């Protein structure tokens, strides 16, 4: 049987938000000039120039 008191509820949530997906479009990435690009040891990757 339908009971109003047992069926009436109060649902709570957030008012508004935006859900993003890319997560890297917010990162602006540039690269150093390739000639002076250093390896893990902090010396130029190609040092025969």
């Amino acid at each position: 049987q339908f009971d109003f008191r047992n069926s009436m509820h109060m649902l709570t949530s957030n008012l508004t938000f935006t859900v993003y997906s890319d997560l890297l479009a917010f990162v602006s990435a540039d690269t150093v000039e390739p000639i002076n690009a250093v390896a893990f040891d902090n010396m130029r990757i190609m040092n025969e120039l």
Partner: protein, 49 residues
């Protein structure tokens, strides 16, 4: 060192100094604009570049 800054591309130190008004000396071979207007000097245009 503006040469090192341009080679590396990381504008973190200089950005922080400019935002925090920390006095600094940017060293390098720079072109300059010769201005002869006392009104400009009073207006403090040299600080807006």
């Amino acid at each position: 060192n503006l040469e090192e800054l341009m080679r590396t591309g990381s504008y973190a130190q200089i950005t922080n100094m400019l935002l925090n008004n920390q006095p600094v000396a940017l060293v390098g071979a720079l072109p300059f604009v010769t201005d002869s207007s006392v009104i400009s000097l009073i207006a403090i245009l040299d600080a807006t570049v």
